[PDB]
Amino acid sequence: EVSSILEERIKGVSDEANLNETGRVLAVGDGIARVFGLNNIQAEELVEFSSGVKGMALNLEPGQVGIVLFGSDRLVKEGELVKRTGNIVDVPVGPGLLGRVVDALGNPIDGKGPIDAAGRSRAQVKAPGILPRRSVHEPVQTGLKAVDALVPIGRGQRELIIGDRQTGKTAVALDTILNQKRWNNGSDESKKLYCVYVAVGQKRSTVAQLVQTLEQHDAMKYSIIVAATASEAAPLQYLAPFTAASIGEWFRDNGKHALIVYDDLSKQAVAYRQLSLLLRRPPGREAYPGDVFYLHSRLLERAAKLSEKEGSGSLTALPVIETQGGDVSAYIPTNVISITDGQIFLEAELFYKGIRPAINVGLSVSRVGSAAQVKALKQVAGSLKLFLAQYREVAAFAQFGSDLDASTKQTLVRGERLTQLLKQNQYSPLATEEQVPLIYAGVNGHLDGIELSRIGEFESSFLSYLKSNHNELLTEIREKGELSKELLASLKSATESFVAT
C-alpha cells in the first residue's frame, strides 16, 4: 500500500544529464544569494541550488546574478553550484485545486494529497485586450444589502475592499462567498463562481480558523485557498497572487466564471518591499519601488469579463488593502485606488457606532455597472441612495442638535430606520428575493414610521410573514428578477399587510 506507493516513487527516479550552466554562490546571507556565472540564465527562470533550494532569478548582473531564495539560508553554502531548472516559474492550473488549500508553489498544504490540475501555466500571463472583453451583465450579490445596492458588483470587475485592519476584514469577503453559495448550489455553471481566496501574510492558525469556517459552511468544495502564510518567503508572497491569477485564468479561459479575493495585498507590498531592497533596488515611495504600480496593474488587469468568444468566462477580482489609519494617500493605497473599478471603504468608527458591517458608504463607489445587480433591486434601491444622500446632509444638521426643520427631521427619522436595516451579523447573508421586500418596505417609507428599536424586531418578523403568506411573491421575484407593476402592487399590499400589524 504505502510500500506500493514508495515502490512507484523509487521507480520514479533514475538518470540525468550534463549541466551546461553553473555558477558558484558567493554572497549568501540576507536570504538572497548572488551567484557568479550563469549567462544561459533566461530572466525570471527557476534555478535549482545544489543545496536543494530553488530560487528564481529576478536580477541579472554581469557580475553576480541575484537569485532570490525560496529556501533556507543555512542550506545554501557559498561556492555551491546552481543548475538552471530552465523553466520560468509555472504552477499547475486546473480544476483539481477546487477544495484545496495550496501554498504559493501549489503544493497542497491541507495535505489532501496531489492536485488534479489540467495544466501548468506561467504566472506572467498578460491581461486580455479591449477586443477580448465583453459588456458586463453578470450580477454578483454578496448577501449584504448595502454592497449590492450601493456598490453593485459585476464580474470581471475589480472592487477594492479598503478600511482598517481585521475589522472583520476577512469576514466581509467571506459573506460574499456565502451568498454566492446560492448561485454555487444553483446548477448554472457560469453563475457558479469558483472562489479563490488568497491569503498573504497570515498565520497558519488564522488560516486554519478560516478553512474551518469555510468547511463548516461547506463552501470549501468550490473554494480554492491559495496561501502564502506568514512563515512563507517574501519572493513566494510576491509570486502568490500571480500564480493564484493563473489558476483563475484557467476558469476564465474555459468560459467559467470565478472570483478572486486578494487578501491582503498590503502584505504582498511589504514582501516586494523587502525583496527589492535585498535585491538592493533603490527604495520607492514608502520603500516600495516605483514599478510596484506596474506589478500590481498587470496582476489586477487579468480580472476581465471576456468576450462571448472566450466563453464569457469572467474572473472577478476583489482586491483587499487593509489601510492602516485609513491612510489612502500611502503610495500603494493611492496606486490601487486608481487601478480598481470600485472602492469599498469601511470605517472603524462606524464599527464602534455599532454599524456592523461598518461601511463608509460616502467613499464606497462602484464606478461600473448596474447589470452588476438585479433589475428589480435596481428599481427598489433607486431612492435608497437618494434617501441616504439626503440623510447625510440631514445628519450634519442633526449634529450640534440644533432644532431641525420638520422636513429635515422627517429625513432623519426615515434615514435612521434604513441604517438599522442595513446592519447584518457576520456569517449570515441574505437571499436577494428576500432583500427586495425589505428595501421595498423601507424605500416605500412604510418603515419610516416604525420605531428604530423595533426595526430589528420588525425585520425578522417581516421575513417570517413573507415566508408564510407572500412566499408566492418571493418566488416571483426569484423567477422574474425585475419588479413588474403587478409585483410592485402585490408587494405594496403585502408590505402594508405586515407594516400595519
All cell numbers assigned to 286 = 514608502
> 28: which 3 cell numbers?
549568501
User: Exposed, middle or buried: residue 67 (CB in 10 Å: 0-12, 13-18, 19+)?
Assistant: buried
Task: Supply 448's cell numbers.
Answer: 419610516
**163 annotated as belonging to a binding site for a ligand:** yes
User: Residue 229 or residue 314: which is nearer to other proteins going by CB?
Assistant: 229
Is the Cβ–Cβ distance between 292 and 271 less than 8 Å?
no
Say whether 343 counts as a known binding-site residue: no
Say whether 209 counts as a known binding-site residue: no
Q: Is 113 annotated as a binding residue?
A: no
Residue 369 marked as a ligand binder: no
Residue 263 marked as a ligand binder: no
Query: In this structure, are strands 64-69 and 54-59 parallel, antiparallel, or unpaired?
Result: antiparallel
Between CA 321 and CA 333 the distance in angstroms is 7
Cβ distance to other proteins smaller for residue 62 or 282: 282
Phi, psi of 144 (to 5 degrees): -105, 120
Q: For residues 263 and 198, is the Cβ–Cβ distance under 8 A? A: yes
Phi, psi at residue 310, to the nearest 5°? -95, 10
- State how beta strands 314-322 and 258-263 pair: parallel
Closer by beta carbon to other proteins, 422 or else 443? 422
**Cα dihedral sign for 27, 28, 29, 30?**
positive
The nearer residue to other proteins, 5 or 131, going by C-beta atoms, is: 5
Whether 414 is catalytic: no
The distance of closest approach from Cβ of residue 480 to other proteins in the complex, given in angstroms and rounded to an integer, is 20
* 383 versus 426: smaller Cβ distance to other proteins: 426
Q: Name residue, grid cell 514608502.
A: 286
Q: For other proteins, which is the closer residue by CB, 32 or 140?
A: 32
SS3 string of 338-364? HHCCEEEEECHHHHHCCCCCCECCCCC
88 contacts 112 by C-beta, under 8 angstroms: no
Identify the helix (H) or strand (E) that includes residue 174. Answer: helix 169-185
d(CA 101, CA 110): 5
Nearer to other proteins, 7 or 482 (CB): 7
CB of 108 to other proteins, least distance (A): 10
Catalytic residue among 100, 122, 252, 367: 367
Indicate the residue among 133 and 356 with the shorter CB distance to other proteins: 356
- Cα 151 to Cα 185, 257, 343, 412, 459: the distances in Å are 24, 20, 8, 23, 23
Q: What's the closest the beta carbon of residue 351 comes to other proteins, in angstroms?
A: 9
Q: What whole-number distance in Å separates Cα of residue 264 and Cα of residue 319?
A: 7
d(CA 66, CA 60): 6
The C-alpha atoms of residue 95 and residue 256 are separated, in whole angstroms, by 11
Residue 168 marked ligand-binding:
yes
Instruction: Give least dist CB 352 to other proteins, A.
Output: 4
Minimum CB distance to other proteins, residue 278 (Å): 6
Q: C-alpha cell of 377? A: 433591486
Beta carbon of residue 274, minimum distance to other proteins (angstroms, whole number): 4
d(CA 459, CA 92): 47
In this structure, are residues 321 and 144 in contact, taking their beta carbons and an 8 Å threshold? no
Residues 6+ apart with CB under 8 A from 218: none
Which residue ranges make up the site for other proteins (CB under 8 A)? Answer: 1-3, 5-7, 10-11, 13-14, 17-18, 26-31, 73-74, 76-79, 101, 103, 109-111, 165-166, 201-209, 212, 227, 229-231, 234, 267, 270-271, 273-274, 277-278, 280, 283, 286-287, 324-325, 327, 349, 352-354, 400-401, 425, 468-469, 471
Q: CB of residue 185 vs other proteins: minimum separation in angstroms?
A: 14
Binding-site positions for ATP read 163-170
Binding-site positions read 163-170
The residues carrying an active-site annotation are 367
